[PDB]
C-alpha cells in the first residue's frame, strides 16, 4: 500500500514561527577568566621551577606563552615533555616571525599540546640571520620538516639538524621569502627560450604592476586600549595611602 508514489510531501509541512528572536548580549571573554587565573598560577609555578631560563610569560584568552632564550630550548622542552604535570608530548607547529625593529629580528615560536591534560602551550625564543637555534629533533621527530620550513622561509638555522635544506622554494632559489625586505614578486621569472630550448630565468618584468592599497590605511586609532583581565592575585599591590 505505501510507496514512494504516496510519500509525504514535507515541503507543505507547517514550519516553525518565531515572532521575536532573543539573543542576549555577552562579552566572549568573561567565559575565560577562571581558566586564565589557572594559567597564571601554572606559569608562576614554572617560573619558580626553572628560574635560570624563563624570562617571562604572557597570557591572553586561554593561550599561554613562555619567553626564553636559544640556550634554554632543549632543557625547557625536556621539562615540558617529561614532567608529569606537563606532558606536552605533541609538537603542533614551529614558526618564525620577522620583527626588523628588534636587534634580534627573528622570533621562533613552538606550539605544543598535551592530549593527556587537554592543553596547549607556547614557547618563544629569538634569533638572527646568523645566530642559530637548537633543534628539538632530539625529542620531537616531527620538528624535522617544520624546521626545514622555517629555514627556507626566513633563514633561521637550526643547529644539530641532520639534513637542513629547502623544502618549499625552488631548487636554486636565492632568497628567503617571508622576510619583510623580500618583495612580493621576487626578483626572477621564467620563460621558454626557443633558441637555447630551455626554461631560463630572467629579471622580473610585470605587465600590470603591483598596487598596494595599504596607503588608504586609517588615520584614526581604530580600537582603543583594551580591558584588564588580570586576576587580582597577580596585580601588583597598591600600598595603603597611609
Amino acid at each position: 500500500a505505501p510507496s514512494w508514489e504516496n510519500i509525504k510531501d514535507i515541503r507543505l509541512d507547517p514550519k516553525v514561527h518565531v515572532d521575536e528572536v532573543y539573543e542576549p548580549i555577552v562579552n566572549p571573554a568573561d567565559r575565560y577568566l577562571q581558566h586564565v587565573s589557572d594559567l597564571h598560577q601554572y606559569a608562576k609555578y614554572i617560573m619558580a621551577a626553572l628560574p635560570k631560563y624563563i624570562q617571562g610569560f604572557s597570557v591572553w584568552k586561554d593561550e599561554l606563552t613562555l619567553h626564553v632564550a636559544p640556550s634554554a630550548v632543549i632543557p625547557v622542552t625536556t621539562f615540558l615533555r617529561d614532567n608529569t604535570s606537563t606532558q606536552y608530548k605533541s609538537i603542533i607547529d614551529i614558526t618564525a616571525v620577522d620583527y626588523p625593529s628588534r636587534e634580534n629580528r627573528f622570533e621562533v615560536v613552538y606550539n605544543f599540546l598535551s592530549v593527556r591534560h587537554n592543553s596547549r602551550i607556547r614557547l618563544k625564543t629569538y634569533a638572527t640571520e646568523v645566530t642559530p637555534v637548537p633543534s628539538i629533533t632530539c625529542l620531537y621527530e616531527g620538528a624535522n620538516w617544520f624546521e626545514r620550513e622555517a629555514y627556507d622561509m626566513y633563514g633561521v638555522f637550526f643547529e644539530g639538524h641532520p639534513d637542513l635544506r629547502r623544502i618549499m622554494t625552488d631548487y636554486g632559489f636565492e632568497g628567503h621569502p617571508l622576510r619583510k625586505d623580500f618583495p612580493l614578486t621576487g626578483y626572477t621569472e621564467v620563460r621558454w627560450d626557443e633558441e637555447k630550448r630551455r626554461v631560463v630565468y630572467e629579471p622580473l618584468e610585470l605587465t600590470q604592476a603591483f598596487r598596494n592599497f595599504s596607503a588608504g590605511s586609517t588615520a584614526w586609532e581604530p580600537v582603543g586600549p583594551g580591558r584588564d583581565d588580570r586576576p587580582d592575585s597577580f596585580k601588583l599591590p597598591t600600598p595603603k595611602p597611609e
Binding site: 521575536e20 624570562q55 604572557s58 586600549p225 596585580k235 600600598p239 595603603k240
Partner: protein
Amino acid sequence: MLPGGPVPVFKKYTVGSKGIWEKLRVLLAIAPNRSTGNPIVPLYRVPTPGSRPEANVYQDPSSYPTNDIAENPYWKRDHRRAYPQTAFFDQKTVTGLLELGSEATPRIADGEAGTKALANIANGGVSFTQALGKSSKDVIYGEVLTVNGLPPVAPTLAPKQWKIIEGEAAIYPKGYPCRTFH
C-alpha cells in the same frame, strides 16, 4: 529498533520500483530496504530556487536587544574595544608578587615606605631566587604550589570526561577493531 534505523523504503525519498518489479526487487535484493538513489523529480529542488515565493516576504533578520531603537547604546555592546589585554610578566613583576603579595592577599607596608619597596624590585634590588628562598611555607604552599603541596596541572578550559559505548549502541559490532566513545 534504535534511534538510528533501519528505516523502510516508503519513507526514503528516492525513485523506486512499482508493481511486479517491486516484488521481484524485494526478492532479489540483498537488503530490500535499500534505494536506487535517484531523487523524486516532483519534490527535489521544486519550486526552483529562482522562483521561491519566500523571497518577497523576506526581511533582514535580527535579534531584539540589538534591534532595539531606544536603550541600545553601542558602547555597551562594543565587544571589540573591550578586548582583554595581553598581560606580560617578567621575573621582576613575579618576584614582587612573591616578596610582596597581591591586591587579594597583600603583605606590603603602607605609605611611601611600601612604595619604595615596590621600587626596589622594579629595579634589580632583590632577585627571584632570593625571594624564593625568603618565602615561608604559607607563601609557596598556597601561591606557587597548591595547599596540598602538589604542583598544578596543565589546565583544561572545557574538560571532557570520556565514556565508552559497547554492544548494540556501538557503531560497529564487537569483532571489529574499532570502538565508539561518547
